[PDB]
Design a binder for this molecule. Structure first.
Ligand code: CLA
Ligand code: CLA
Ligand code: CLA
Ligand code: CLA
Ligand code: CLA
Ligand code: CLA
Ligand code: CLA
Ligand SMILES: CCCCCCCCCCCCCCCCCC(=O)OC[C@H](CO[C@@H]1O[C@H](CO)[C@H](O)[C@H](O)[C@H]1O)OC(=O)CCCCCCCCCCCCCCCCC
Ligand SMILES: CCCCCCCCCCCCCCCC(=O)OC[C@H](COP(=O)(O)OC[C@@H](O)CO)OC(=O)CCCCCCCCCCCCCCC
Ligand SMILES: CC1=C(/C=C/C(C)=C/C=C/C(C)=C/C=C/C=C(C)/C=C/C=C(C)/C=C/C2=C(C)CCCC2(C)C)C(C)(C)CCC1
Ligand SMILES: CC1=C(C/C=C(\C)CCC[C@H](C)CCC[C@H](C)CCCC(C)C)C(=O)c2ccccc2C1=O
Ligand code: SF4
Lengths: 40, 80, 131, 33, 146, 73, 743, 132
C-alpha cells in the first residue's frame, strides 16, 4: 500500500489525474451553463 | 594548425592526454598543483579539433582550451 | 637521419590562428598536387612506379615502405636526447664505480635493451647498475 | 540598325561573357603566384 | 578457389583484384585504347579520341533537338555538336594550364604542358571532322537491301 | 536539405566518391588540385538560409503579381 | 538427454510495488536520482533497452518474451473494443440489409459543445461518424448477421486479453524460461510454421466452409438476415448444406477416398470477382486457405528436433559457399541465435515488406464483400498499410546497425559474407550513389523538361503520349500475359486473377468496382520516380549499417556508440555521423517515397478506374481522365490534384466533415512547429533558459532539478516526430474528407 | 611481417605515395583476430607485425585495440615519399599519460581562462587574445 501510494504520487500519474479532474469540471460546467461569451 | 592552450587551473588528472585521438598532449612535471604534473601540447600539428580533451577536463572552466584555426590535411582528417 | 626533414616544409605559419609547425612539422615536404595516370611506358609523378601493362592502377603500386633495420635507427635518433637526459641524471646520483656516460649507457642498455632503458627511473637504473 | 542589337548582344552577354569570366576565375584561383 | 585477391599482393592498398578489375579482357581493352596505348604521339592520341567522340554526338542533337523535324535538322545538329566540342576544348585548355603550368621540359609525356596542348589540338580536329563525317553518312542512309 | 542534414554524413559520402575517381580507369588521367571536401558547418547554414530566403521571396513575388494582375488587370 | 527440452526457473522475480516507486531502477546511472531535467527524458528513452539494463542474455530474453505478451493483451483489448462499439454504437444491422445505400458508422460523439455536428446522418435512422476501417465488410464475410454475435466476440476478446496479461506475469515472475529454452530455432520454426500458420489456416477454412460460405450465399441470393438459419443449424443439419452445396450429401467419404473432385461445389478456382458483392468468391478463398494449410504443415517438418530426421540450419548455411564469397554463410547461425537485434532486423524488414504487398494485392483483388465500391475504405486501407510498412522497413535497418555496433565480433566473422561486405563497402556505396544520381536526374528531369516546354508554348517537345513518348513496354507485356493466362498457362482457372490486368468492368450499385488499368507514358515517369526515392532511402540506411563501426573520418566510431551526437567541430565538422543519424535522415526520405506512392494511387484511381457507369456503357471517372496529360508536369499535380482535390477539406466547415478541416490545419501547424527543432541548436536554447531562470531566482524560487535544454539527439528526434505527424496527418484528413464525398 | 588480411577497398590511396604515409609495429605472443580500422578482420602473426595506414588517428585507434590484447610495445612511424622516417609514438619511450622527467611545458598560460585580454585592446595587431 505505502509503495503503491508512492507510485500514485509520482509526477506523471498526479498530472493525469489532476488534469482529468480539471477537464471534467470544465466540461461539466459547460454542460449545465452552456454558450457563454461573457458573464451574461 | 589549431591552437591548444593549458591554464594554471590544471590539476594533473591526465584525463585530457588519455582522450586525445592523435597524441597531441603530454603530461609534464610541474609544482603548481598537488599532483605535481601539468599538461602540455607539444604536437598541435596533429590536432584534429575534436575537443574530446575539453570534454574530459574536470575544472570549473576548461583548463585546456582548443581554438580552431588554420586547416591542413592533418587537421581536416583527410585520408585521401 | 634528417630530424628536420619534416620541419623543412613550404608551410609558413600565419600571424594569429595557427598552432605552427609543432614538433614534427605541419605538412609533408612534398606537394600532393601531382598529375594523373600516364600511357604505357611513361611516368608521371616524378619518382612514380611504372604501371607496367596496367598504368591505370599504377598509384596502387607501393614504393614507400619502412625497413625494420632502418626503423631501429630512427627510433634511436629521435630519442637520443631523452636517453642523454636519463643517463646524465644517473651519473649525477653518484654511480657506483662510474666510468663514462657513453660506457655506462652501453652497459645499462646491453642489459634491459634500449626501450626498457628509456622507460626506467634513475633509481631503478642505479639498482640495476649496482654491479 | 539598332533593332538588330538584341539578337547580336544577348548571345554574347549570356553565353560568351559568362564562359570567359568563369575560365579566368578558375585560372586565377588555381595559380600559385 | 578465390577470384578476389589483394591488388598487387598488397593487403593494405585500397584496391582489389577482381575479375572486373583484372581480367584478360579488361587488361587487353585498356592497353590498346588510344589513351594508354604504347607508341602513340600526343597528337595522335587526341585525334583518335576525338574521332571516336564526335561521331556519336551528332545523333542526340539531330534526332531530339529543337529543329529535329525541320528539313535543316541535320545541319542544325552538326552546328550544335561543333558548339559542344568547343566547350569541351575550352575545358581541356584550361585544365592544362592549371595542372601543368607554363614551361615544360620532359616532353613526350602526356602529362606535360606541350604534350597536353598537342593532345587538345588533336581532339578538336578529330571531333569536328568526325562530326562532319557523320553528317555525310546520315545524309543518305543505306537500306542494305538486294 | 542544408538545414536539416549536417556535415558528418556528407563528408563520409564524398570520401567514397574520391575513391571511385582514383580507381576508375580513363578518368584517372584527370585529377583535382583542390582536395574535395564537404561544406563547413557555418557555410551550410548560410547556404541553406539563402536558399530558403530566395525561394520565399520569389514565390510570393509571383503570387502578388499574377493574382492581382490576373484578376484586376 | 533430449536435444530439445523445457527448462524453466521457478519464482524468479518477486512481485511488489517497491520498484514502481523508484523511477529509474532499471538503470545504474538513472537510479542515483534526478539532478537535472535530462534525467527525466533519459528515463523514458532507456526504458526498453534491456541490453543496457543487464549483461545476461537470459535476462534480456526473459523480459522480451513477457513484454510480447503485454502487446498481445493490448491488441486483444483493441479488437474487443471495436466489436463492442460495433454492437452498441453502430448501424451494422441496417447496412446489412441495404449495403449499397447505408454508410458504415461505429463511433458516436456526445452532445457536448456543438461537437454533435460531427454525428452525420449516415443512414438507417442512425447518426454517427463514418468509419473507414472496413469492419462491416469483414463481419459480413464471416457471416455475423446479428449484433449479439458481435457482443460475444467482444467478451471473448476481453477474456483473451486477460489471459495474455497473466501469461506475461507468470512467465517472468513465476516460471521464467532459461536461455537454453529460447535457443531452439529448429523447434520454434517447426511449431510456428505448422501449428500457428498451418493449423490456423485449416481452422479458418473450417469456419469458412461450414459457416461463412453457406450464410453468404443466402445473403447474396436475397434472404433477409433474420430469415437466414443460425450458424449452429448449418453445422448440425447436413441436409440444409446439401441444398446450397450439393456435395455435402456424400459426406467425408469422398475425402478419405481419393475423390476430392466431388467437393468442387465449394472448393473452386473461379477467379475474378463476385458480380453481386464485388468481392472475391468465398469458395476460392476457402480452397486458398486449405491449400496453404497443407503446404505450411508439410514445411513444419523440415528441421531436426529430437528424432534424427530433419535438417540442421547450421549445416545448410555452412555448406553454401562459393568461389567469390569465401567462407560463405558460416557464422550467421550463431549471430541469429545469439543476437536479438539481428533477428529483429530481418523480421522487421520482412514484416514491413509484407504490409506493402498487402496494400497492392488487396485493392487489385478486393477480398471483402462491398469493399471496392466503398472508395473511402479502399483508400484508407491502402495508405494505412503502406505507411506501417515504411516505418517497419526503416526500423529493420536501424536494428541492423545496432547489431554491428553492439553484437558484431570480428573473431566470429572471418572471411564470411559479412566480413567481405564490410571490406568493399566503399565500392558498394560509391556505386549506389551514382545509381541514385542517374535515376534522379533522368526521372525528375522529365518533369522539369515538360514544365519548361509547356510554359514556353512548345507542347510538341514534351515527353508525352502525344509527343516524344516513353511507353512502359515491359509492363504492358506482362499485363497481356496475365490476361491471356486463364485457359492457357492456367488451364483450370476461369478468369483473371485481377481485372486490372484486363477484362470487363465489374460494377456494383452503379459504381465501378474494378476495371482494366492501362499504363502509358505518365505511368512510366512515375514508376521510375518511385525507384529513385526507394534507392536513396536504401543508400542512407545501408551507409549507416556498413559504416557504423568505423570510417575514414572517425576510425573509432564503434566506441562512441550507436547514438552519439557527433565527435566534434574538428575534421571540418563531424556532426550527425552516427548510425542513429542515418536512420534519422532515412525516415525523411521514406516519408517522401510513401507520400508519392499514395498520391499516385489516389489520382490514378480517381481518374482511370473509380467512377460510375450507366446502364449502357458510359463510364464517368471521378476526375475525368486528367492523369494522362496533367500528371506529366509538376504544375499539373499542384493544380489538378492538390489544389482541386482539396476543395473538400477547405470547405468542410459547418458540416459533419468539419473535423477533417480542423485537423488539416492543426497538422500543418505541427509540421511547421517541428522546423524549429530541426534548424536550431541546443546552445541558443540553453542560454535563453539561463535568463529565464534568473527571473525565478530573483523571486527567491527555482527548481532543484535544474532546467536544461534538450540534448542534441533528442532535439532531432522531437523534430522528426512532429514533422512526420504533421505531414501524415495533413494527408490523412485530405484523403478522408475527399473520399467521403467521392463515395 | 604483415598480418594476415585478404584485402579491402578501404586501404590507402595516392596521398600515401605522394604526400605522406604511416606505419605501426608490434609484437604478439599468439595469433589472434583483430578488427582493423579500415574495415574487416585480420589475424596477427605470432611475433613481429607491421601494418601501413594513411592517418595517425587510424594507427592510434588500432593501438587502443592492441592494449586490450595486452600489447604495449607498439610503435608508430611516418614515412615520407622520399623514404625519410619519423618516429612519432611513444615519442620519449614513455607513454604520454605518464609524467616523464625531462619533458618541458609548451603552450601554457599562467592564469585562469578568464584573465585573457579583451579583443578590442589588441585590435589591428594580428595577434589573438588567446595568443596575447
Ligand atoms: C526539393 C528539395 C531537395 C532536392 C532537390 C534535393 C536533392 C538531392 N538530395 Mg536531398 N534532401 C532534402 C531536399 C532536397 N534534396 C531535404 C529536405 C533533406 C532532409 C532530410 C534531404 C536529405 C538528403 C539526403 C540525406 C540525401 C539527399 C540526396 C539528394 C540527391 C539525390 C541525388 C539526385 O537525384 O541528384 C539529382 C538532383 C536533382 C536536384 C535532380 C534535378 C536536377 C535536374 C532536373 C537534373 C539536371 C540538372 C543538371 C545536372 C545541371 C543543370 C545545369 C544548370 C541547371 C545550371 C540530390 C542532390 C542524397 C544524395 O546526395 O545521394 C546522391 C542523400 O543521400 N537528400
Ligand atoms: C542568353 C543565353 C542563352 C542563349 C542565347 C541560348 C540559345 C539557345 N539555346 Mg540555350 N541555354 C541557356 C542559355 C542560352 N541559350 C542556359 C543558361 C541553359 C541551361 C538551362 C540552356 C539550355 C539549353 C538546352 C538544353 C538547349 C538550348 C538550346 C538553345 C538553342 C535553341 C535555338 C535553336 O535554333 O536551336 C537549334 C540550334 C542551332 C541552330 C545551333 C546554333 C549554333 C550553336 C549555338 C553555336 C554555338 C557555338 C558557340 C560559340 C560555342 C560557345 C563557346 C564558348 C567559349 C562560350 C539556342 C541557340 C537547344 C539547342 O539546340 O542547343 C543548341 C537545347 O537543346 N539551351
Ligand atoms: C535530365 C532529363 C532530360 C532529358 C533526357 C531531356 C531530353 C531532351 N531535352 Mg531537355 N531539359 C531538361 C531535362 C531533360 N531533357 C531540363 C531539366 C530542362 C530545364 C533546364 C530542359 C530544357 C530543355 C530545352 C530548353 C530544350 C531541351 C531539349 C531536349 C531534347 C534535346 C536533347 C539534346 O540535345 O541532348 C544532347 C545530349 C547529349 C549530347 C548527350 C546525351 C547523353 C548520352 C546519350 C549518354 C550516353 C551514356 C552511355 C550509354 C554510357 C555507356 C557508354 C559505353 C557503352 C561505351 C531532348 C528530348 C531541346 C528540345 O528540342 O526539346 C525537345 C531544347 O530546346 N531541354
Ligand atoms: C481501443 C480501445 C477503445 C477505444 C479507443 C475506445 C474509445 C471510446 N469508447 Mg470504448 N470500449 C472499449 C474500447 C475502446 N473504446 C471496450 C473494450 C469496451 C468494452 C468495455 C468499451 C465500451 C464503451 C462504452 C460502454 C462506451 C465507450 C465509449 C467510448 C468513447 C468515449 C470514450 C470515453 O469514455 O471517453 C471519456 C473517458 C472516460 C470517462 C474515462 C475517464 C478518464 C480516465 C479516468 C483517465 C485514465 C486514468 C489514468 C489511466 C490513471 C492511471 C493510473 C495507473 C494505475 C495507470 C470513445 C470513442 C462511450 C461512448 O461512445 O459513448 C457514446 C461509451 O458509452 N466504450
Ligand atoms: C500487478 C502486478 C505486477 C507487479 C506488482 C509487478 C512488479 C514488478 N515487475 Mg512486473 N509484470 C507484470 C505484473 C506485475 N509486475 C505483468 C502482468 C507482466 C507482463 C507484461 C510483467 C512484466 C515484467 C517485466 C518484463 C519486468 C517486470 C519488472 C517488475 C519489477 C519492477 C517494476 C517496474 O518495472 O515498474 C514498471 C511500472 C510501470 C507502471 C510500467 C507500466 C507500463 C505500462 C504497462 C505500459 C502500457 C500502458 C499503455 C497501455 C500504453 C500507452 C498508452 C516489479 C517487481 C521488471 C524487473 O524489475 O525485472 C527484474 C521487468 O524487467 N515485470
Ligand atoms: C504449436 C505451438 C505454438 C503456437 C501456436 C505458437 C504461437 C505463437 N508463439 Mg510460440 N513457441 C512454440 C510453439 C508455439 N507458438 C514453441 C515450441 C516455442 C519454443 C521453441 C515457442 C517460442 C516462442 C517465443 C520465444 C515467442 C513465441 C511467440 C508466439 C506468438 C507470435 C505472435 C503471433 O503470431 O500472434 C498470434 C496470436 C494469436 C494467434 C493469439 C492466440 C495465442 C494463443 C497462445 C494460441 C494457443 C492455442 C489456442 C488456445 C488455440 C487452441 C485450439 C482450440 C481452440 C481447439 C504466437 C502466439 C512470440 C510471442 O509474442 O509470444 C508471446 C515470442 O516472442 N513463441
Ligand atoms: C517490433 C518493433 C520494435 C521493437 C520491439 C523495438 C525495440 C527497440 N528499439 Mg526500435 N524501432 C522500430 C521498431 C521497434 N523497436 C522502428 C519501426 C523504428 C523506426 C522508426 C525504430 C527505431 C529505433 C531507434 C532509432 C532506436 C530504437 C531503439 C530501440 C530499443 C529501445 C527502445 C526505447 O528506447 O524504448 C523507449 C520507447 C519510446 C520512448 C517510444 C515512445 C513513443 C514515442 C514518444 C513516439 C510516440 C508517437 C505517437 C504514436 C504519436 C501520437 C500522436 C498523438 C500524441 C497526437 C528497443 C530494443 C533505441 C535503442 O537504443 O536501441 C538499442 C534507438 O536508438 N529503435
Ligand atoms: C566539304 C567540301 C565541299 C563542301 C561544299 O561544296 O558545300 C556544298 C554542300 C551544301 O549542302 C547543303 O546542305 C544543306 C543541308 O542539307 C542544304 O539543305 C543543301 O543540301 C545544301 O545547299 O555542303 C555540304 O553540305 C557538305 C559539306 C560537309 C563537310 C564535311 C565535314 C568536314 C569537317 C567540318 C568541320 C570543320 C571544322 C574544323 C575541321 C578540322
Ligand atoms: C548478381 C549475380 C550473382 O548472383 O553473382 C553471385 C556471385 C557468385 O556467388 P558464389 O556462387 O561464388 O557464392 C555462393 C555463396 O554466396 C552462396 O550462394 O557472388 C558475387 O560475387 C556478387 C558480386 C556483387 C554483385 C554485382 C552487382
Ligand atoms: C556495346 C558494346 C560494344 C561497343 C560499342 C560501341 C561503343 C561502339 C562505338 C562506336 C563508335 C563511337 C565509332 C566511331 C566511329 C567514328 C568514325 C568512323 C569517324 C570517322 C572520321 C573520319 C573518317 C574522318 C574525318 C575527317 C577528319 C579526321 C578531319 C578532316 C575531315 C574528315 C571528314 C576527313 C561492342 C560492340 C564493342 C561489344 C559489346 C559491348
Ligand atoms: C549536399 C551537401 C554537401 C555537398 C555539396 C557540395 C559538395 C556542393 C558541390 C556543388 C557546388 C555547386 C560546387 C560545384 C562547383 C563546380 C565544381 C565549379 C567550381 C569552379 C570553381 C572555380 C569555383 C555538403 O558539403 C554539406 C555540408 C554540411 C551540411 C550539409 C551538406 C550538404 O547537404
Ligand atoms: S582537440 Fe582532439 S586532437 Fe586536439 S588536443 Fe584535444 S583531443 Fe587531442
Amino acid at each position: 500500500m505505502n509503495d503503491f501510494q508512492k507510485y500514485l504520487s509520482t509526477a506523471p500519474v498526479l498530472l493525469t489525474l489532476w488534469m482529468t479532474f480539471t477537464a471534467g469540471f470544465i466540461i461539466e460546467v459547460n454542460r449545465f451553463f452552456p454558450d457563454m461569451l461573457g458573464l451574461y | 594548425s589549431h591552437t591548444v592552450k593549458i591554464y594554471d587551473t590544471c590539476i594533473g588528472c591526465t584525463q585530457c592526454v588519455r582522450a586525445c585521438p592523435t597524441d597531441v598532449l603530454e603530461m609534464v612535471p610541474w609544482d603548481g598543483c598537488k599532483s605535481g604534473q601539468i599538461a602540455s601540447s607539444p604536437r598541435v600539428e596533429d590536432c584534429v579539433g575534436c575537443k574530446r580533451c575539453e570534454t574530459a577536463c574536470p575544472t570549473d572552466f576548461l583548463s585546456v582550451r582548443v581554438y580552431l584555426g588554420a586547416e591542413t590535411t592533418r587537421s581536416l582528417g583527410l585520408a585521401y | 637521419v634528417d630530424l628536420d626533414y619534416g620541419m623543412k616544409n613550404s608551410y609558413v605559419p600565419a600571424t594569429g590562428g595557427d598552432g605552427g609547425q609543432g614538433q614534427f612539422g605541419a605538412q609533408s615536404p612534398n606537394d600532393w598536387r601531382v598529375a594523373g595516370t600516364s600511357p604505357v611506358g611513361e611516368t608521371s609523378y616524378a619518382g612514380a612506379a611504372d604501371g607496367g601493362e596496367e598504368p591505370w592502377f599504377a598509384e596502387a603500386i607501393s614504393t614507400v615502405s619502412l625497413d625494420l633495420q632502418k626503423a631501429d635507427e630512427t627510433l634511436k635518433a629521435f630519442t637520443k636526447d631523452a636517453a642523454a637526459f636519463k643517463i646524465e641524471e644517473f651519473a649525477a646520483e653518484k654511480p657506483y664505480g662510474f666510468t663514462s656516460s657513453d660506457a655506462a649507457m652501453e652497459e645499462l642498455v646491453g642489459k634491459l635493451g634500449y626501450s626498457k632503458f628509456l622507460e626506467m627511473s634513475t633509481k631503478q637504473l642505479m639498482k640495476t647498475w649496482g654491479t | 540598325a539598332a533593332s538588330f542589337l538584341p539578337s547580336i548582344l544577348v548571345p554574347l552577354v549570356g553565353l560568351i561573357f559568362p564562359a570567359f569570366s568563369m575560365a579566368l576565375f578558375f585560372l586565377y584561383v588555381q595559380t600559385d603566384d | 578457389a578465390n577470384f578476389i585477391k589483394p591488388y598487387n599482393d598488397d593487403p593494405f592498398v585500397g584496391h582489389l583484384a577482381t575479375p572486373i578489375t583484372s581480367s584478360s579482357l579488361t587488361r587487353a581493352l585498356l592497353k590498346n585504347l588510344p589513351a594508354y596505348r604504347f607508341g602513340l604521339t600526343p597528337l595522335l592520341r587526341g585525334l583518335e579520341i576525338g574521332l571516336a567522340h564526335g561521331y556519336f554526338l551528332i545523333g542526340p542533337f539531330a534526332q531530339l533537338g529543337p529543329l529535329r523535324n525541320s528539313d535543316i535538322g541535320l545541319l542544325a545538329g552538326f552546328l550544335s555538336t561543333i558548339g559542344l566540342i568547343l566547350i569541351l576544348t575550352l575545358g581541356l585548355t584550361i585544365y592544362g594550364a592549371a595542372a601543368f603550368g607554363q614551361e615544360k621540359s620532359n616532353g613526350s609525356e602526356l602529362q606535360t604542358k606541350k604534350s597536353w596542348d598537342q593532345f587538345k589540338g588533336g581532339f578538336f580536329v578529330g571531333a569536328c571532322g568526325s562530326a562532319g563525317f557523320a553528317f555525310i553518312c546520315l545524309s543518305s542512309i543505306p537500306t542494305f537491301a538486294l | 536539405m542544408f538545414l536539416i542534414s549536417w556535415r558528418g554524413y556528407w563528408q563520409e559520402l564524398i570520401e567514397t566518391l574520391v575513391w571511385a575517381h582514383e580507381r576508375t580507369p580513363l578518368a584517372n588521367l584527370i585529377r583535382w588540385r583542390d582536395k574535395p571536401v564537404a561544406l563547413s558547418i557555418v557555410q551550410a547554414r548560410l547556404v541553406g538560409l539563402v536558399h530558403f530566403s530566395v525561394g520565399y521571396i520569389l514565390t510570393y513575388a509571383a503570387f502578388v503579381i499574377a493574382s492581382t494582375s490576373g484578376k484586376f488587370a | 538427454s533430449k536435444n530439445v527440452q523445457v527448462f524453466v526457473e521457478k519464482d524468479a522475480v518477486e512481485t511488489s510495488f517497491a520498484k514502481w516507486a523508484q523511477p529509474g531502477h532499471f538503470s545504474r546511472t538513472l537510479a542515483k536520482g534526478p539532478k537535472t531535467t535530462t534525467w527525466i527524458w533519459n528515463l523514458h528513452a532507456d526504458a526498453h533497452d534491456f541490453d543496457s539494463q543487464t549483461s545476461s542474455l537470459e535476462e534480456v530474453s526473459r523480459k522480451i518474451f513477457s513484454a510480447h505478451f503485454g502487446q498481445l493483451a493490448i491488441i486483444f483489448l483493441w479488437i474487443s473494443g471495436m466489436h463492442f462499439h460495433g454492437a452498441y454504437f453502430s448501424n451494422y444491422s441496417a447496412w446489412l440489409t441495404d449495403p449499397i445505400s447505408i454508410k458504415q458508422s461505429s463511433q458516436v460523439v456526445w452532445p457536448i459543445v456543438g461537437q454533435e455536428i460531427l454525428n452525420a446522418d449516415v443512414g438507417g435512422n442512425f447518426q454517427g461518424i463514418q468509419t473507414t476501417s472496413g469492419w462491416f465488410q469483414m463481419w459480413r464475410a464471416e457471416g455475423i448477421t446479428s449484433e449479439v454475435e458481435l457482443y460475444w466476440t467482444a467478451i471473448g476478446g476481453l477474456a483473451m486479453s486477460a489471459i495474455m496479461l497473466f501469461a506475461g506475469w507468470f512467465h517472468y515472475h513465476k516460471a521464467a524460461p532459461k536461455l537454453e529454452w529460447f535457443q531452439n530455432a529448429e523447434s520454434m520454426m517447426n511449431h510456428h510454421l505448422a501449428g500457428l500458420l498451418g493449423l490456423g489456416c485449416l481452422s479458418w477454412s473450417g469456419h469458412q466452409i461450414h459457416i461463412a460460405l453457406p450464410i453468404n450465399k443466402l445473403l447474396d441470393a436475397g434472404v433477409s438476415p433474420q430469415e437466414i438459419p443460425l450458424p449452429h443449424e448449418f453445422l448440425i443439419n447436413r441436409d440444409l448444406m446439401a441444398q446450397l452445396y450439393p456435395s455435402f450429401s456424400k459426406g467425408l467419404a469422398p475425402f478419405f477416398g481419393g475423390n476430392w473432385g466431388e467437393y468442387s461445389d465449394f472448393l473452386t478456382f473461379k477467379g475474378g470477382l463476385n458480380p453481386v458483392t464485388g468481392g472475391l468468391w468465398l469458395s476460392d478463398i476457402a480452397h486458398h486457405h486449405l491449400a496453404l494449410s497443407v503446404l505450411f504443415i508439410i514445411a513444419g517438418h523440415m528441421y531436426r528436433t529430437n528424432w534424427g530426421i530433419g535438417h540442421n540450419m547450421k549445416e545448410i548455411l555452412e555448406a553454401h559457399k562459393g568461389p567469390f564469397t569465401g567462407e560463405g554463410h558460416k557464422g550467421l547461425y550463431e549471430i541469429l541465435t545469439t543476437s536479438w537485434h539481428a533477428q529483429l532486423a530481418i523480421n522487421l524488414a520482412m514484416m514491413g515488406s509484407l504490409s506493402i504487398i498487402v496494400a497492392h494485392h488487396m485493392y487489385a483483388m478486393p477480398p471483402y464483400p462491398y469493399l471496392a465500391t466503398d472508395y473511402a475504405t479502399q483508400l484508407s486501407l491502402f495508405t494505412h498499410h503502406m505507411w506501417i510498412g515504411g516505418f517497419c522497413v526503416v526500423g529493420g535497418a536501424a536494428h541492423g546497425a545496432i547489431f554491428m555496433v553492439r553484437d558484431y565480433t570480428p573473431a566470429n566473422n572471418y572471411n564470411n559474407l559479412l566480413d567481405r561486405v564490410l571490406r568493399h563497402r566503399d565500392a558498394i556505396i560509391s556505386h549506389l550513389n551514382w545509381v541514385c544520381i542517374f535515376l534522379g536526374c533522368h526521372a525528375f528531369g522529365f518533369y522539369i523538361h515538360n514544365d519548361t516546354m509547356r510554359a514556353l508554348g512548345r507542347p510538341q517537345d514534351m515527353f508525352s503520349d502525344k509527343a516524344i513518348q516513353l511507353q512502359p513496354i515491359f509492363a504492358q507485356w506482362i499485363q497481356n500475359i496475365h490476361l491471356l493466362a486463364p485457359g492457357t498457362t492456367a488451364p483450370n482457372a476461369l478468369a483473371t486473377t485481377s481485372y486490372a490486368f484486363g477484362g470487363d468492368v465489374i460494377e456494383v450499385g452503379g459504381k465501378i468496382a474494378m476495371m482494366p488499368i492501362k499504363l502509358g507514358t505518365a505511368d512510366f515517369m512515375v514508376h521510375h520516380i518511385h525507384a529513385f526515392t526507394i534507392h536513396v532511402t536504401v543508400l542512407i540506411l545501408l551507409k549507416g549499417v556498413l559504416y557504423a563501426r568505423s570510417s575514414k573520418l572517425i576510425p573509432d566510431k564503434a566506441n562512441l556508440g550507436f547514438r552519439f551526437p557527433c565527435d566534434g567541430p574538428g575534421r571540418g565538422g563531424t556532426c550527425q555521423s552516427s548510425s542513429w543519424d542515418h536512420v534519422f535522415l532515412g525516415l525523411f526520405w521514406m516519408y517522401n517515397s510513401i507520400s508519392v506512392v499514395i498520391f499516385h494511387f489516389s489520382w490514378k484511381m480517381q481518374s482511370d478506374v473509380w467512377g460510375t457507369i450507366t446502364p449502357d456503357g458510359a463510364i464517368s471517372h471521378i476526375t475525368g481522365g486528367n492523369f494522362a496529360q496533367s500528371s506529366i508536369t509538376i504544375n499539373g499535380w499542384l493544380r489538378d490534384f492538390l489544389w482541386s482535390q482539396a476543395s473538400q477539406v477547405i470547405q468542410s466547415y459547418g458540416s459533419a466533415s468539419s473535423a477533417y478541416g480542423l485537423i488539416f490545419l492543426g497538422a500543418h501547424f505541427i509540421w511547421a512547429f517541428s522546423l524549429m527543432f530541426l534548424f536550431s541548436g541546443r546552445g541558443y536554447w540553453q542560454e535563453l533558459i539561463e535568463s529565464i531562470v534568473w527571473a525565478h531566482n530573483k523571486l527567491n524560487f527555482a527548481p532543484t532539478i535544474q532546467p536544461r535544454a534538450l540534448s542534441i539527439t533528442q532535439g532531432r528526434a522531437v523534430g522528426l516526430a512532429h514533422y512526420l505527424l504533421g505531414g501524415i496527418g495533413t494527408t490523412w484528413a485530405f484523403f478522408l474528407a475527399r473520399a467521403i464525398s467521392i463515395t | 611481417p604483415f598480418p594476415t588480411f585478404g584485402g579491402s577497398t578501404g586501404g590507402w590511396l595516392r596521398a600515401a605515395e605522394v604526400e605522406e604515409k604511416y606505419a605501426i609495429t608490434w609484437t604478439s605472443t599468439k595469433e589472434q583476430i583483430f578488427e582493423m580500422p579500415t574495415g574487416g578482420a585480420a589475424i596477427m602473426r605470432n611475433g613481429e607485425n607491421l601494418l601501413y595506414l594513411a592517418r595517425k588517428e587510424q594507427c592510434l585507434a588500432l593501438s587502443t585495440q592492441l592494449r586490450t590484447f595486452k600489447i604495449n610495445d607498439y610503435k608508430i612511424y611516418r614515412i615520407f615519399p622520399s623514404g625519410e622516417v619519423q618516429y612519432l609514438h611513444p615519442k620519449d619511450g614513455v607513454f604520454p599519460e605518464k609524467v616523464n622527467p625531462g619533458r618541458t611545458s609548451v603552450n601554457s598560460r599562467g592564469f585562469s581562462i578568464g584573465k585573457n585580454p579583451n579583443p578590442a585592446s589588441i585590435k589591428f595587431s594580428g595577434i589573438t587574445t588567446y595568443e596575447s
